[PDB]
Symmetry: D2
Subunit: 79 residues, 4 copies
């Protein structure tokens, strides 16, 4: 059981994290830097910020919204 | 404009903003799953399965960067939306 | 069923809403004024709470899927 | 303190925090405990209230706070 602060630092360093308290299964977060996104996103418009994604239960890729439940929780772990 | 009306404008591909925001010249824009897949990827090597995105809403922020838009309670409840 | 815009007005009118597409069951949203804080210790906005799958009350944070979805229903 | 994880610990101890990089000036966050919330709202004594983070905005409005991803990743947090 990691705090959100611990999970956050690990996410910053390129690891994947998740909460056991989430309802959906097999989900996780991953962080992409501005440089990574400048290459990955080919759809035209220039400069991305850092974006955290959540791989969801249906295996789709979404933007992760930091819920208060998530940020206050201490049930985080590393994939 | 309510947020419900701003959402309908977003789903039509146009850009929306709140006057009550602090940062200037910001706006939201929506990219669909099909749009995000178009020319997506590092382009070197092959995925087992092509990534499938959900819809993503971006915000063009006051420093002219592109971020993921987190819908705030203030945003969602506000009545000060407009089209760019 | 309902759009998020419709769910928001139902919330403002004192009813409870949820998405049928959520993973967790037995959850819902409800809205109150934050002016209940005035007695503690400014313009008070409304607050959207979530009653969670593990029976807690938190301040709700919409995902992008939540606000784009058309599967909202009334409790 | 600097990171968001540190700011959350400051919030939990009852102090106020802000980001110097925010566009709005003189804003801050504060956290109310389950006990304080149940007393204020009249329910959730234990369905039980959790903690809730609020924001006082630059226009003097009070809302439940929603973190942006930039907020959570930022290192410019400070104590009021
Ligand atoms: N298809 C998704 N698209 C975007 N984002 C998603 C998806 N799927 C999951 N998320 C995010 O993971 C968190 C935990 O997942 P979860 O426990 O399974 O959520 P849920 O039961 O479906 O309820 C929903 C509430 O959860 C909170 O955080 C959720 C979501 O932010 C939110 O406030 C939700 O309103
Ligand atoms: N570089 C950004 N990166 C990501 N997201 C951003 C950025 N810049 C702006 N946003 C988003 O637009 C909203 C309105 O913009 P804003 O009025 O100028 O925000 P603010 O004064 O800087 O921060 C105070 C609070 O605003 C709320 O919504 C903000 C942000 O979600 C949040 O809860 C903030 O914690
Ligand atoms: Mg590219």
């Amino acid at each position: 059981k990691m705090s959100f602060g611990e999970a956050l630092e690990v996410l910053k360093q390129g690891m994947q994290v998740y909460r056991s308290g989430w309802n959906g299964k097999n989900m996780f977060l991953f962080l992409k830097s501005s440089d990574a996104l400048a290459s990955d996103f080919g759809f035209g418009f220039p400069v991305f910020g850092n974006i955290i994604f959540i791989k969801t239960a249906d295996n789709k890729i979404h933007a992760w919204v930091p819920s208060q439940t998530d940020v206050l929780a201490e049930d985080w772990d590393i994939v």
